[PDB]
Amino acid sequence: APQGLAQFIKVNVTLENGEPVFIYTDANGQVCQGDITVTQAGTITYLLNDQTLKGLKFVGVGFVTPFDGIIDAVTISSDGMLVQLVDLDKTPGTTKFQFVLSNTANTLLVLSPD
C-alpha cells in the first residue's frame, strides 16, 4: 500500500498594534518561515494557536491561483482548529496561500499575509 509524508506546522497568532501577526513553529517548537516543500505525495497539517483574544477559527485556505494543481484538497476540523492540505505532488511548482479565519470581534474575515 503506497504511503506518503505528513508534515506539520503550528500557526501561532498574536496581535501587534491591534492587528494579527502570524508566526509559524515546526514540530520541534522552533520558529520557522512557514513554507513547506513537498517531495512526494502526502499531507500538510496546520494547527491554530490563537493567542489574540479575537476568537479566531479557520474557515478555509485561500488561493489567488486555486486551479494551479499544486494543492488537491483542503479539509477542516469542525472546531476550526485544524486545516489539512492534500498534495499529490504531481504538478511541479509553487503556490502561495492565505489562511482564512473568522473572528468573534467582527464579521470581517481574517487573512494571513499575501
Partner: peptide
C-alpha cells in the same frame, strides 16, 4: 505561506 512541489 507557500508550498513548493518537487515531483518524483
Amino acid at each position: 505561506p507557500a508550498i513548493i512541489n518537487r515531483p518524483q
